[PDB]
Amino acid sequence: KFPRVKNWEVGSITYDTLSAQAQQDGPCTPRRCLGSLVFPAPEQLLSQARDFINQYYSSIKRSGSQAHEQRLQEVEAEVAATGTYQLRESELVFGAKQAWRNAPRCVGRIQWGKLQVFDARDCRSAQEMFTYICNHIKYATNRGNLRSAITVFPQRCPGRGDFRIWNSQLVRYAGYRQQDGSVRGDPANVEITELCIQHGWTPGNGRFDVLPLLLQAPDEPPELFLLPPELVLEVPLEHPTLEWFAALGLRWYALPAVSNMLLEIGGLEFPAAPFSGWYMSTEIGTRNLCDPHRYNILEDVAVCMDLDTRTTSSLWKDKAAVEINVAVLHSYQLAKVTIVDHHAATASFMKHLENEQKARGGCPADWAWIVPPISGSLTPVFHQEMVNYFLSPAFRYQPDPW
Amino acid sequence: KFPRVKNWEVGSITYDTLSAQAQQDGPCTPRRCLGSLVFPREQLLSQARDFINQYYSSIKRSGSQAHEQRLQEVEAEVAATGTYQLRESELVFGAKQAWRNAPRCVGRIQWGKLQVFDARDCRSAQEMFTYICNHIKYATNRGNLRSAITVFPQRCPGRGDFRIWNSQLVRYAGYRQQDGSVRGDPANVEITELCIQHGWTPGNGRFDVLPLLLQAPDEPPELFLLPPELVLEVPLEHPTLEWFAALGLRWYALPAVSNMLLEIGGLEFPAAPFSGWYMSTEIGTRNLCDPHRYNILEDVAVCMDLDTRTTSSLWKDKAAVEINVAVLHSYQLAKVTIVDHHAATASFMKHLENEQKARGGCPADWAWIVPPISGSLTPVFHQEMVNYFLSPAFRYQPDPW
Ligand code: HEM
Ligand code: HEM
Ligand SMILES: CNCCc1cc(F)c(F)c(OCc2cc(C)cc(N)n2)c1
Ligand SMILES: CNCCc1cc(F)c(F)c(OCc2cc(C)cc(N)n2)c1
Ligand SMILES: C[C@H](O)[C@H](O)[C@H]1CNc2nc(N)[nH]c(=O)c2N1
Ligand SMILES: C[C@H](O)[C@H](O)[C@H]1CNc2nc(N)[nH]c(=O)c2N1
Ligand SMILES: [Ca+2]
Ligand SMILES: [Ca+2]
Ligand SMILES: [Cl-]
Ligand SMILES: [Cl-]
Ligand SMILES: [Gd]
Ligand SMILES: [Zn+2]
Numbered sequence A: 001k002f003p004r005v006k007n008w009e010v011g012s013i014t015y016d017t018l019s020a021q022a023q024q025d026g027p028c029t030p031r032r033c034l035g036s037l038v039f040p041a042p043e044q045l046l047s048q049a050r051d052f053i054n055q056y057y058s059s060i061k062r063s064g065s066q067a068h069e070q071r072l073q074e075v076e077a078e079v080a081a082t083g084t085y086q087l088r089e090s091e092l093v094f095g096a097k098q099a100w101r102n103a104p105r106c107v108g109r110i111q112w113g114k115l116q117v118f119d120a121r122d123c124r125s126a127q128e129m130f131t132y133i134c135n136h137i138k139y140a141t142n143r144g145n146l147r148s149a150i151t152v153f154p155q156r157c158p159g160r161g162d163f164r165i166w167n168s169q170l171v172r173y174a175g176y177r178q179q180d181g182s183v184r185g186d187p188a189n190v191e192i193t194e195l196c197i198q199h200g201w202t203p204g205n206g207r208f209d210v211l212p213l214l215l216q217a218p219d220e221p222p223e224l225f226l227l228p229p230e231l232v233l234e235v236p237l238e239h240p241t242l243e244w245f246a247a248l249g250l251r252w253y254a255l256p257a258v259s260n261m262l263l264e265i266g267g268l269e270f271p272a273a274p275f276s277g278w279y280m281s282t283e284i285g286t287r288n289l290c291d292p293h294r295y296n297i298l299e300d301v302a303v304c305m306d307l308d309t310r311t312t313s314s315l316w317k318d319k320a321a322v323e324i325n326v327a328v329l330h331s332y333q334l335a336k337v338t339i340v341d342h343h344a345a346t347a348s349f350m351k352h353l354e355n356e357q358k359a360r361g362g363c364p365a366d367w368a369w370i371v372p373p374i375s376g377s378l379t380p381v382f383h384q385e386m387v388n389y390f391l392s393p394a395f396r397y398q399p400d401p402w
Numbered sequence B: 001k002f003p004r005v006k007n008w009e010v011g012s013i014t015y016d017t018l019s020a021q022a023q024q025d026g027p028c029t030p031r032r033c034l035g036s037l038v039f040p041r042e043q044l045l046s047q048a049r050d051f052i053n054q055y056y057s058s059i060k061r062s063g064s065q066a067h068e069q070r071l072q073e074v075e076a077e078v079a080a081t082g083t084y085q086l087r088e089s090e091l092v093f094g095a096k097q098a099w100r101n102a103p104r105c106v107g108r109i110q111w112g113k114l115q116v117f118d119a120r121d122c123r124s125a126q127e128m129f130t131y132i133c134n135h136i137k138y139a140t141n142r143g144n145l146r147s148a149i150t151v152f153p154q155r156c157p158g159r160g161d162f163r164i165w166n167s168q169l170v171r172y173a174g175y176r177q178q179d180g181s182v183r184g185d186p187a188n189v190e191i192t193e194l195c196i197q198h199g200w201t202p203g204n205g206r207f208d209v210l211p212l213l214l215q216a217p218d219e220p221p222e223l224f225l226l227p228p229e230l231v232l233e234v235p236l237e238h239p240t241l242e243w244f245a246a247l248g249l250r251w252y253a254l255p256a257v258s259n260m261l262l263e264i265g266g267l268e269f270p271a272a273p274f275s276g277w278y279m280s281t282e283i284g285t286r287n288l289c290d291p292h293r294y295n296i297l298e299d300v301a302v303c304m305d306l307d308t309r310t311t312s313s314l315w316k317d318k319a320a321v322e323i324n325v326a327v328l329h330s331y332q333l334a335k336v337t338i339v340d341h342h343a344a345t346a347s348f349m350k351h352l353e354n355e356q357k358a359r360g361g362c363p364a365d366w367a368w369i370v371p372p373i374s375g376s377l378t379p380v381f382h383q384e385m386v387n388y389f390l391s392p393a394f395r396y397q398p399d400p401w
Helices: A045-059 A066-082 A089-101 A127-142 A187-198 A243-248 A281-291 A298-304 A317-332 A342-359 B044-058 B064-079 B088-101 B125-141 B186-197 B241-249 B280-289 B297-303 B314-333 B342-356
Strands: A004-006 A012-015 A115-119 A149-152 A174-179 A183-185 A213-216 A223-225 A235-236 A251-253 A263-265 A268-270 A394-396 B005-008 B013-015 B115-117 B148-151 B174-176 B183-186 B212-215 B222-224 B234-236 B251-254 B262-263 B268-271 B391-393
Touching: A045 A089, A066 B148, A089 A149, A089 A263, A089 A394, A115 A127, A127 A149, A127 A213, A174 A187, A183 A187, A187 A213, A187 B183, A223 B088, A223 B342, A243 A298, A251 A281, A281 A317, A298 A317, A298 B064, A317 B314, B044 B064, B088 B115, B088 B148, B088 B262, B088 B391, B115 B125, B125 B148, B125 B222, B174 B186, B183 B186, B186 B212, B234 B314, B234 B342, B241 B297, B251 B280, B280 B314, B297 B314
Parallel strands: A115 A149, B115 B148
Antiparallel strands: A004 A012, A174 A183, A213 A223, A235 A251, A263 A268, A263 A394, B005 B013, B174 B183, B212 B222, B234 B251, B262 B268, B262 B391
16 A cells, blocks of 8 residues: 555545655665655666656657657667767756656745756857856846746766856855854855855955856866846845834845756756746745844844843744745835745645646655745645655755865 | 764754664655654563663663563563563653653653653542542642653453543533534544533533543443643733733643553553643644634734735734734743743753763654744754654554544
8 A cells, every 4th residue: 555645634635656656765764764854877777768758758648659669769779879868858848847846845846837948958168058047047037027947958978077056056145254253144155155266256245245156067177157237136125014124234136046956867967957936935034034054133133123032932033033024025026026925835835736646646745845934834734744755857966066 | 874963053963873773663664754644554571671671771770680580570470461560660760761752742851850650550430530630630730830641550461441532631622513613622523522422411612621531441431520620721811912812712731641552661551641731832823723723813813903815914924923922921921831932942952962962862753843833943943853763652542432
């Protein structure tokens, strides 16, 4: 029998038949669960590509057709003579969508089918890589009306180095290790900040200094690239009724563009394939601004609110956090930048699970990442039991290139 | 082999070496992780042996004197009966261990101070009800809560079990209406109609304290009404929103779970109620704001003059905070022990640090340690955890029908 999952709010029961098709293996054994840990080729390449090809011909309802037959044999032959193969442009488009659809920690998969795939498999240098990124940013930002997108740079192949983007996201704020042990700016970006300087960049001294891009072309050092300021949409944060809030001088960028995972399709590995959608307000308001080890503003906002930060039973942390989230949602809507609050995001996610159950009979979901970082049990995914597993195509974590 | 565990807030690293002694098997496989599911699913000498070894090493009387004799004592008892009797001191230690080993409990910093009430000499349901009321009075203590557990007779072969049919000792009723919905606590719809089927005459309020359905071996259960001066309750009011008290909301003081089986040394106690004191989110977020419980959130939001027709006003977040503020203020007013999730999580962090030095790790189920509001504002959000089952432990068990 398959895992039986319960929804507690509604009382309903499903079985995840899909998890039986899980390819790569995860960290949990019957002895102990590790589901909370953040970071846990000839004939096996064939059986991966074969499985992918079948996936592609199932999607279009033409499985077993002569063309499906022929493409499998076509892939079998290219693997024999070269050791690898190339995806058709259609298989790449469907592949990238599959990788998003399968990402178990992403709460926005209701949108997985509307994804703009930019094919950069012919990219030749770091200079063409920057050109391609700017086009991505331009297209996805779209002057505030955000459009999901991914750009796929050339696949890993033996003999040659990988294309890589050393930056973890396309838009990132500098983190200047302050001399007194602290940080001015974003502390998550202290190491990449040190690398940018060392690689030629003249640092600022603000707190929302946009980092340049380090782009590395195969078997080359990374080259330094500055984003055009008008290409990088930013939102100053102000609060609809707390008017001193604007004097905090808080800003955040419009476009979340993850640039350092590996996209894996049919056994082929793309080390550089940045993707981007639109923000959920709690990533900005709760995690990026209030995490103790991020901008950590939550005490400073509460003191401004005249809360009693002396005892925890006033729930000043909770009150100041809510208001910082109100400000994000309001400032982004004022600027007419796409954004989704965690109640909308999680309710649409429940619709995705219902779709995926009709469609594939399951959906890999990582509870600790789907449940938002405030107001958890107030959203419907709290009460939803989930099964976590690894399907391919997938986005995967990969070592930092340095 | 030894899971590496990281605190992302600090950057600290430890290795859980205690996980290797995982007595049982949980629900997860290399293929799929089920750590989000609420319930999964002679050789007694081995479990019995292993518990005694824990005991004596625990009091530093390791594998020596009274150790070697206790071993051959229980071997002989099981040879003659099929089962064996715990020493009372062992009983104390296995209770505190079972609490210490419960991975979903954030309150384990308190695992040293626990009041064990030996009720193994208990026969008939009227003695049950007496044993229960002493417990309730001892633990309520006029609002200064003291953790405690009473242990009723263990399961033995060829026999019947002592069962408290009630999931908790304090449970508000839940009457179904011909309009399909519920007046009261929906969680308790099934127990309420059992109280009625087996005798009780129903009230009609949103907070009618149920009767107890206590059951003796090979006998049906009997209702027992609790004396209302024993069941300490807290009317809920808000420190500044004067209208809150008029909503008529009220919770009880003593969290007392009465339907989990206790396991010690291969012995199973199908009736052993335990109690501590509440963490405010249990009442204010889960019991009152969960869509399938009292589900009061939208009522408070309306009274608060909040914009309830667009999700981005975070009206749900604001109304939930104030319901918690009301809980924390109403318990302090009545001098009833309560703890907020910020204090409770910071204490659980200390307990991890303790347990790292004492036992080399600590079984913890992240989904249940992290509070259900302001998750990432508490320090246990940023702490990787390892979940596993050690014995002694508390286990869920099937209902007696
Ligand atoms: C369109 C709006 C989208 C929203 C609102 C959204 C939401 C989220 C959120 C809240 C997370 C958790 C991030 C964290 O806290 O670490 C996440 C993770 C993730 N997202 Fe999405 N997402 C969107 C689009 C996309 C797209 C277009 C892709 C890829 C094509 C994608 C792939 C992923 C992956 C692989 C992860 C897991 C990576 C990680 O968090 O370590 N998402 N998403
Ligand atoms: C300081 C006192 C205590 C606090 C603050 C506390 C807090 C909590 C919380 C928040 C939970 C999760 C609630 C849930 O799962 O719905 C829990 C669960 C649990 N606790 Fe504690 N608790 C305390 C005392 C105790 C005692 C005295 C025992 C046993 C002797 C115990 C054993 C357990 C068990 C077995 C669970 C299982 C959760 C479940 O059944 O769903 N706790 N505790
Ligand atoms: C402190 N949190 C961890 C930061 C973090 C690390 C990653 F590796 C991510 F992949 C990520 O995803 C962010 C994201 C991506 C997309 C496409 C949409 C969206 N709404 N959010 C966030
Ligand atoms: C909707 N959630 C499920 C409700 C629930 C189910 C159980 F089976 C429990 F065991 C439990 O125990 C909660 C508890 C126990 C003690 C002794 C102290 C404390 N503060 N909390 C709560
Ligand atoms: C240690 C803990 O698992 C870690 O901080 C995770 C938990 N869940 C999360 N969930 C989301 N969405 N984002 C995160 O960064 C995290 N962090
Ligand atoms: C599906 C999910 O695991 C389930 O709702 C859990 C999550 N965390 C919880 N945490 C606590 N404290 N109590 C609960 O009942 C739950 N329920
Ligand atoms: Ca070709
Ligand atoms: Ca009717
Ligand atoms: Cl981010
Ligand atoms: Cl409760
Ligand atoms: Gd104002
Ligand atoms: Zn697991």
